[PDB]
Design an enzyme around this catalytic site. Structure first.
Site, PDB file in Angstrom:
ATOM      1  N   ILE A 241      40.472  20.735  61.130  1.00 40.79           N
ATOM      2  CA  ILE A 241      39.129  21.037  61.854  1.00 40.79           C
ATOM      3  C   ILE A 241      37.860  21.086  61.426  1.00 40.79           C
ATOM      4  CG2 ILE A 241      39.023  23.775  61.159  1.00 40.79           C
ATOM      5  CD1 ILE A 241      38.290  22.572  64.311  1.00 40.79           C
TER       6      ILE A 241
ATOM      7  N   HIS B  59      51.673  22.675  54.211  1.00 40.65           N
ATOM      8  CA  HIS B  59      50.787  22.342  55.006  1.00 40.65           C
ATOM      9  C   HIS B  59      50.391  20.461  54.229  1.00 40.65           C
ATOM     10  CE1 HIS B  59      47.998  24.651  53.451  1.00 40.65           C
ATOM     11  NE2 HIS B  59      47.116  23.512  53.682  1.00 40.65           N
TER      12      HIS B  59
HETATM   13  C1  LIG Z   1      42.234  22.186  52.076  1.00 35.20           C
HETATM   14  C2  LIG Z   1      42.008  24.350  52.266  1.00 35.20           C
HETATM   15  N1  LIG Z   1      43.003  24.824  51.563  1.00 35.20           N
HETATM   16  S1  LIG Z   1      44.584  24.442  52.605  1.00 35.20           S
HETATM   17  O1  LIG Z   1      45.148  23.983  51.470  1.00 35.20           O
HETATM   18  O2  LIG Z   1      45.045  25.635  52.362  1.00 35.20           O
HETATM   19  O3  LIG Z   1      44.399  23.618  54.053  1.00 35.20           O
HETATM   20  C3  LIG Z   1      44.047  24.705  55.483  1.00 35.20           C
HETATM   21  C4  LIG Z   1      43.563  23.236  55.904  1.00 35.20           C
HETATM   22  O4  LIG Z   1      43.775  24.016  57.683  1.00 35.20           O
HETATM   23  C5  LIG Z   1      42.632  24.590  57.857  1.00 35.20           C
HETATM   24  N2  LIG Z   1      42.440  24.406  59.538  1.00 35.20           N
HETATM   25  C6  LIG Z   1      42.283  25.894  59.570  1.00 35.20           C
HETATM   26  N3  LIG Z   1      42.217  26.464  60.782  1.00 35.20           N
HETATM   27  C7  LIG Z   1      42.698  25.301  61.879  1.00 35.20           C
HETATM   28  C8  LIG Z   1      43.244  24.686  63.140  1.00 35.20           C
HETATM   29  N4  LIG Z   1      42.827  25.524  64.175  1.00 35.20           N
HETATM   30  N5  LIG Z   1      43.548  23.149  62.847  1.00 35.20           N
HETATM   31  C9  LIG Z   1      43.001  22.203  62.428  1.00 35.20           C
HETATM   32  N6  LIG Z   1      43.366  22.904  61.102  1.00 35.20           N
HETATM   33  C10 LIG Z   1      43.124  24.266  60.647  1.00 35.20           C
HETATM   34  C11 LIG Z   1      41.484  24.463  57.465  1.00 35.20           C
HETATM   35  O5  LIG Z   1      40.276  22.836  57.875  1.00 35.20           O
HETATM   36  C12 LIG Z   1      41.897  23.665  55.895  1.00 35.20           C
HETATM   37  O6  LIG Z   1      41.644  21.897  56.164  1.00 35.20           O
END
Ligand SMILES: CCNS(=O)(=O)OC[C@H]1O[C@@H](n2cnc3c(N)ncnc32)[C@H](O)[C@@H]1O
Ligand SMILES: CCNS(=O)(=O)OC[C@H]1O[C@@H](n2cnc3c(N)ncnc32)[C@H](O)[C@@H]1O
Lengths: 114, 114
Positions: free
Chosen positions: A32, A100
């Site tokens: 996102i 992830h």
């Molecule tokens: C790297 C930062 N931190 S992270 O390593 O924890 O990666 C989490 C990722 O998931 C995300 N995210 C949160 N909600 C959604 C969603 N509904 N759809 C897609 N991605 C999402 C953020 O954009 C982020 O890039």
């Protein structure tokens, strides 16, 4: 199933995502907040809070995440390559506690990787 | 065995490295050009040129790289976390064509990851 994080809801399909691949083990969808022209995530349906909590038995599953990542990258036309990233804890930049795999491409990735 | 890249020689022990872990499947050693206080690589002994060339059967092996990475990170005392990175091709920043997993820690990792 799926756990109780943002990704848990995505897995249970309670909240939609731009899903680009789904099998019995994982799901892949666009990030996102893209940091590159192409930036999607690959997550296991099994809830593993973080890479440090993964067990020896989760090896095939973790490798499956990368295999799916290379396939999706291929579908999305990333011929010049890409970068896969897995963040762990505070220093890693992890904010969602469900393992992830980030896959970024569409532009030259720099060094250091953050 | 090991292939014909810089890492192939490291595997055959023709040229030493700061090896921190070794089993029948992979090897882990410190990166010669660290981008963080702790920065090492985990590579498979099997020669896979790049993630895009990995096959479905290589899943366990790839996951093994991450499991070893989390263990080594643990041995090196990375309690606040870390970031794992796999580069593919030109855009990914890959310069050595033998799959390798970067593990960086010891400092806050930034975003974007390059
Ligand atoms: C790297 C930062 N931190 S992270 O390593 O924890 O990666 C989490 C990722 O998931 C995300 N995210 C949160 N909600 C959604 C969603 N509904 N759809 C897609 N991605 C999402 C953020 O954009 C982020 O890039
Ligand atoms: C990210 C850039 N491109 S890369 O994704 O291809 O990663 C290669 C890494 O292996 C490296 N390297 C080359 N020779 C050695 C060596 N003898 N010991 C340890 N690391 C080495 C570089 O420091 C680099 O960080």
């Amino acid at each position: 199933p799926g756990g109780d994080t943002i990704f848990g809801k995505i897995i249970r399909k309670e909240i939609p995502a731009k899903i680009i691949f789904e099998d019995d083990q994982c799901l892949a969808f666009h990030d996102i907040s893209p940091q590159a022209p192409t930036h999607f995530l690959v997550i296991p349906k099994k809830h593993i809070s973080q890479i440090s909590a993964a067990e020896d038995a989760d090896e095939s599953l973790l490798g499956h995440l990368m295999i799916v990542g290379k396939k999706c990258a291929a579908d999305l036309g990333l011929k010049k390559g890409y970068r896969m990233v897995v963040n762990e804890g505070s220093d890693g930049g992890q904010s969602v506690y469900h393992v992830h795999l980030h896959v970024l491409g569409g532009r030259q990735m720099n060094w250091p990787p953050g």
